[PDB]
Amino acid sequence: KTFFGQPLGLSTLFMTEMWERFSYYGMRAILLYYMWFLISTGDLHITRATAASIMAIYASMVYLSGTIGGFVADRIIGARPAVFWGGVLIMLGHIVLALPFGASALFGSIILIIIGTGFLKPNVSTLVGTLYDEHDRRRDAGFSIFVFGINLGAFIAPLIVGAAQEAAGYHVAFSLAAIGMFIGLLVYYFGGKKTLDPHYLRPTDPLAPEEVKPLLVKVSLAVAGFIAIIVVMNLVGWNSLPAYINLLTIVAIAIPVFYFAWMISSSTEHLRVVSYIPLFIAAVLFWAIEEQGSVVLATFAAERVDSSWFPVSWFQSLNPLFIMLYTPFFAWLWTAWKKNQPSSPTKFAVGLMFAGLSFLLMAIPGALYGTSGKVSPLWLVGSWALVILGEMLISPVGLSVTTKNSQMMSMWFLSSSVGSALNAQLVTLYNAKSEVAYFSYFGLGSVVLGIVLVFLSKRIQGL
Numbered sequence: 001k002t003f004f005g006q007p008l009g010l011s012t013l014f015m016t017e018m019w020e021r022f023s024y025y026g027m028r029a030i031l032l033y034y035m036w037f038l039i040s041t042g043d044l045h046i047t048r049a050t051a052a053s054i055m056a057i058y059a060s061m062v063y064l065s066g067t068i069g070g071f072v073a074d075r076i077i078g079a080r081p082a083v084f085w086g087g088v089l090i091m092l093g094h095i096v097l098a099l100p101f102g103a104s105a106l107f108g109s110i111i112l113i114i115i116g117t118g119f120l121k122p123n124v125s126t127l128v129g130t131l132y133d134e135h136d137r138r139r140d141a142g143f144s145i146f147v148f149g150i151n152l153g154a155f156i157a158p159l160i161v162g163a164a165q166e167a168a169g170y171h172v173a174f175s176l177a178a179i180g181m182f183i184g185l186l187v188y189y190f191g192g193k194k195t196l197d198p199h200y201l202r203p204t205d206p207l208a209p210e211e212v213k214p215l216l217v218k219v220s221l222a223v224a225g226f227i228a229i230i231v232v233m234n235l236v237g238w239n240s241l242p243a244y245i246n247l248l249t250i251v252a253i254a255i256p257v258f259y260f261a262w263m264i265s266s267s268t269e270h271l272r273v274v275s276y277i278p279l280f281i282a283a284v285l286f287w288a289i290e291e292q293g294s295v296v297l298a299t300f301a302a303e304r305v306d307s308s309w310f311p312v313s314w315f316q317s318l319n320p321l322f323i324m325l326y327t328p329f330f331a332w333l334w335t336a337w338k339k340n341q342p343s344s345p346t347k348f349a350v351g352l353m354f355a356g357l358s359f360l361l362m363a364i365p366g367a368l369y370g371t372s373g374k375v376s377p378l379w380l381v382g383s384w385a386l387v388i389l390g391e392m393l394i395s396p397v398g399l400s401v402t403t404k405n406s407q408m409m410s411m412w413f414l415s416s417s418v419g420s421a422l423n424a425q426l427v428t429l430y431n432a433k434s435e436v437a438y439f440s441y442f443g444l445g446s447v448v449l450g451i452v453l454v455f456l457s458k459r460i461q462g463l
């Protein structure tokens with residue numbers, strides 16, 4: 001008796017992540033429109049450009065805390081309570097938005113989910129591995145099934161939460177995301193006791209008595225500095241929301257920049273570290289375009305599409321839908337393609353070009369029909385079809401390339417945060433008048449950088 005040939009404990013983690021992703025993407029399917037609504041009622045005193053910028057840097061920070069939660073579980077609290085309390089914090093963030101408050105609660109909600117997701121996201125995946133003994137061949141299949149639950153929860157969420165918003169408003173819709181995470185907690189708590197190893201109720205590499213003080217020193221310096229920077233900013237008058245967004249952008253980009261300067265400074269090993277830079281650049285750019293689906297394309301869906309008969313947030317389901325459609329294809333493909341399968345950097349290259357083609361595609365309707373009318377939903381369908389096609393190329397191979405150390409490995413995960421941070425800047429350039437320029441410009445540029453990468457793709461391979 002199994003769960004698709006896997007240990008029964010996988011079903012518990014399948015359900016857990018499905019409902020967490022449900023809560024996350026259900027919220028992000030409507031959060032932008034929600035901010036638009038608050039602005040329209042004079043409740044939220046920002047521009048739409050700023051609102052969209054918030055979406056991007058919010059994503060960026062969620063990914064950033066994700067690279068930290070694994071450490072916290074392994075060394076301090078344990079993987080299983082990390083997931084649980086991470087879940088509680090996520091639920092609370094959604095609770096906060098369900099309350100009769102308005103713009104005043106946006107910050108508290110965002111902070112809660114950033115921290116909570118950071119605790120839950122990397123450690124659920126960790127617990128999936130713990131189901132299999134070392135050298136169990138089912139491991140790949142198991143993680144593949146787990147990912148399917150992630151995509152599934154991301155697919156039904158905008159459909160259900162978006163419908164709820166249309167029916168009963170934002171506060172009810174947000175409460176459904178909260179309920180979703182709660183379901184995840186229910187199945188996780190009572191399901192984990194039955195099948196998860198008690199070993200992971202505690203940290204696996206707990207701090208040694210001599211390790212505690214320098215860690216405390218380390219984290220307290222970082223906080224002190226961060227606080228100091230925020231102090232100076234307010235003194236010199238750089239205390240607007242765009243200013244803080246710029247600060248987090250800087251932090252998000254400085255972290256990998258420092259790591260690269262750190263590695264390159266500290267002979268044969270070296271060339272590869274330099275060799276990874278164009279790949280890391282290609283990763284950031286792909287994620288940038290891909291992350292804009294919930295921001296720029298969300299705006300385009302709400303303003304430029306004949307979507308009078310269905311909740312416009314439903315467009316956010318296309319991303320995980322195409323992932324699920326493409327997945328069993330590429331599974332077969334990389335297997336059947338035995339003879340001369342492309343290298344990992346080529347995938348990176350072609351992947352970025354596809355993401356670039358997705359934006360180029362979106363430039364056509366405005367150039368052909370103008371940007372004052374509305375166009376068919378199919379333009380967006382085609383765009384997501386393309387960029388997900390690019391994801392199938394670069395995503396399954398991403399951590400594979402970069403692992404050919406500990407900070408270096410984290411940097412694949414950070415490419416997601418940096419592309420999103422870059423988005424916090426670029427996304428403010430998009431509007432009705434600049435639409436055709438925006439898409440063409442960043443579309444062509446991405447393709448060319450993919451063109452460059454394929455030229456470079458052999459030297460890097462050999463290394």
Ligand SMILES: CCCCCCC/C=C/CCCCCC(=O)OC[C@@H](O)CO
Binds near residue numbers: 376382
């Ligand atoms: C792997 C999939 C490849 C997909 C790439 C591109 C395919 C889809 C392109 C979208 C064509 C636009 C649809 C035009 C249409 O239906 O007519 C409506 C007209 O009013 C235009 O707004």
Ligand SMILES: CCCCCCC/C=C\CCCCCC(=O)OC[C@@H](O)CO
Binds near residue numbers: 080082190191196201
């Ligand atoms: C919120 C809905 C779930 C019901 C749980 C009620 C218990 C309330 C407080 C105590 C919870 C601490 C649990 C920590 C933990 O590691 O749980 C995970 C493990 O037991 C199962 O996977």
Ligand SMILES: CCCCCCC/C=C\CCCCCC(=O)OC[C@@H](O)CO
Binds near residue numbers: 100169
């Ligand atoms: C451990 C408990 C988890 C419970 C999750 C939270 C959900 C429970 C109740 C949801 C509240 C519904 C929203 C109330 C509301 O004001 O709706 C909108 C109203 O203003 C008019 O449309």
Ligand SMILES: CCCCCCC/C=C\CCCCCC(=O)OC[C@H](O)CO
Binds near residue numbers: 361364
């Ligand atoms: C199995 C492959 C099927 C699709 C081929 C891949 C993409 C190549 C070309 C797609 C079309 C490019 C955009 C042009 C376009 O949609 O024009 C539409 C009309 O202008 C709308 O009335």
Ligand SMILES: CCCCCCC/C=C\CCCCCC(=O)OC[C@H](O)CO
Binds near residue numbers: 364367368
């Ligand atoms: C592999 C996909 C191939 C798809 C078909 C080729 C697409 C090439 C260019 C499409 C964009 C052309 C739009 C028309 C346009 O902008 O006209 C401009 C006029 O001068 C404006 O007054």
Ligand SMILES: CCCCCCC/C=C\CCCCCC(=O)OC[C@H](O)CO
Binds near residue numbers: 364
């Ligand atoms: C399906 C595969 C790839 C399809 C994408 C091919 C599209 C080719 C070029 C993108 C759009 C062309 C730019 C149009 C343009 O800049 O003209 C200016 C407008 O008239 C006004 O802004």
